[PDB]
Amino acid sequence: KVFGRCELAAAMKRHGLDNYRGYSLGNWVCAAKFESNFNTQATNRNTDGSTDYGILQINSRWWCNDGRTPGSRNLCNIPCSALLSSDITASVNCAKKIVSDGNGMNAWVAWRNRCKGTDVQAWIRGCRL
Numbered sequence: 001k002v003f004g005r006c007e008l009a010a011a012m013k014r015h016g017l018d019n020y021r022g023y024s025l026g027n028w029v030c031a032a033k034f035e036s037n038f039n040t041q042a043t044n045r046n047t048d049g050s051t052d053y054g055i056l057q058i059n060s061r062w063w064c065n066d067g068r069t070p071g072s073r074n075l076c077n078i079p080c081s082a083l084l085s086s087d088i089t090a091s092v093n094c095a096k097k098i099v100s101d102g103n104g105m106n107a108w109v110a111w112r113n114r115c116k117g118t119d120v121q122a123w124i125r126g127c128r129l
């Protein structure tokens with residue numbers, strides 16, 4: 001599913017991301033925009049052989065099992081495929097784990113490089129929330 005901007009903001013809000021670990025909702029929408037273009041089906045291979053999955057591009061090296069990343073962990077206790085669902089519940093729950101790990105939203109390279117320090121409230125402007 002390819003979400004609209006405000007549709008995703010609402011979904012994220014309902015699943016408790018707004019101000020989760022101090023990150024306002026715009027931060028999460030902005031990260032989703034630049035990680036996946038709001039597409040739950042997005043996948044990208046990494047050089048190490050791990051793959052990033054879903055609207056928040058969650059990596060199989062640590063967070064999900066895809067059966068092809070040897071030596072990796074599955075800290076979210078989910079198949080990576082669960083992260084590609086039109087229902088973002090699994091992605092949001094696993095994102096909460098990641099952002100709690102110590103490095104905050106710096107875990108998301110696109111967040112750090114294109115959202116951090118910017119006017120992220122823009123991403124939820126005009127939305128009914």
Ligand SMILES: [Cl-]
Nearest residue numbers: 004005006007
């Ligand atoms: Cl929308």
Ligand SMILES: [Cl-]
Nearest residue numbers: 004005033038
């Ligand atoms: Cl947009």
Ligand SMILES: [Cl-]
Nearest residue numbers: 024025026121
């Ligand atoms: Cl915001």
Ligand SMILES: [Cl-]
Nearest residue numbers: 065078079080
């Ligand atoms: Cl699994």
Ligand SMILES: [Cl-]
Nearest residue numbers: 011087088089
């Ligand atoms: Cl959803």
Ligand SMILES: [Cl-]
Nearest residue numbers: 021103104105
């Ligand atoms: Cl933080």
Ligand code: NA
Nearest residue numbers: 060064072073
């Ligand atoms: Na894994």
